[PDB]
């Protein structure tokens, strides 16, 4: 087409979605990761994770307001990945990289799994 | 912080949100612009438009599944702006620029109003 494009639009949208999450505006699901609860927008989770895409496109699961993750999932790893979904920034540290990579494999976040594998390879 | 950032994340999220819109997945509102209906995600509309942000943060309006816009709003102008919200690309043409600018002023999309004003100034 003959369109013009606003370079910062996608980043500005994501920043506003994170501001809505902060202010608990229109959050429509609670993700339970053992003893912790995380509120989020189903659409953002589906846009970032192959696991959430499969969950919320299922005719029965799309209607649930609470999703319980596998008990082996680490809440801190999930929290770091949820922040990445809403900001593009990944708080990857020597002390959390194994939990983050395991959580990203479970959530099917291929780009995160890729950077974790590379950082682990560099340490060996 | 000591975060790393995935450059293409925000653009990839927006592309996936547009794929959900295409496939009518988790759309939760219908915007009526005279005889036309447009399905969308309330969160994306709020992230892009000062008008939708004010509408869906209102305690009564946040619960509506149908929003009727002012009858003076042109459906084609709205359609072009809705596509911009989900893609960052604005289909601005000599034949639609006045309707697009008027719709962007009503929707409170300051960056779009700015580019329309500049393109109009260049023609004069």
């Amino acid at each position: 087409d003959s369109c013009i494009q606003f370079t910062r639009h996608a980043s500005d949208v994501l920043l506003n979605l994170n501001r809505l999450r902060s202010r608990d505006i229109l959050t429509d699901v609670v993700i339970v990761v053992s003893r912790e609860q995380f509120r989020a927008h189903k659409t953002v989770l589906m846009a970032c994770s192959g696991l959430f895409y499969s969950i919320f496109t299922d005719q029965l699961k799309c209607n649930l307001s609470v999703i319980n993750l596998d008990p082996e999932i680490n809440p801190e790893g999930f929290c770091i990945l949820l922040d990445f979904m809403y900001t593009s920034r990944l708080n990857l540290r020597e002390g959390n990289i194994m939990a983050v990579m395991a959580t990203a494999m479970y959530l099917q976040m291929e780009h995160v799994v890729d950077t974790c594998r590379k950082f682990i390879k560099a340490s060996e | 912080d000591s975060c790393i950032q995935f450059t293409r994340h925000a653009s990839d999220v927006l592309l996936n949100l547009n794929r959900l819109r295409s496939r009518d997945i988790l759309t939760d509102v219908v915007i009526v612009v005279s005889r036309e209906q447009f399905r969308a995600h309330k969160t994306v509309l709020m992230a892009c438009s000062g008008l939708f942000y004010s509408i869906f943060t209102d305690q009564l309006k946040c619960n509506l599944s149908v929003i009727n816009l002012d009858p003076e709003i042109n459906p084609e102008g709205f359609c072009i702006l809705l596509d911009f919200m989900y893609t960052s690309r604005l289909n601005l043409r000599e034949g639609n620029i006045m309707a697009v600018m008027a719709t962007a002023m009503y929707l409170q999309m300051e960056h779009v109003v700015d580019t329309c004003r500049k393109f109009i100034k260049a023609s004069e």
Binding site: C3, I4, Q5, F6, T7 | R89, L90, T115
Partner: peptide, 4 residues
């Protein structure tokens, strides 16, 4: 704004 740019030409994409």
């Amino acid at each position: 704004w740019v030409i994409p």
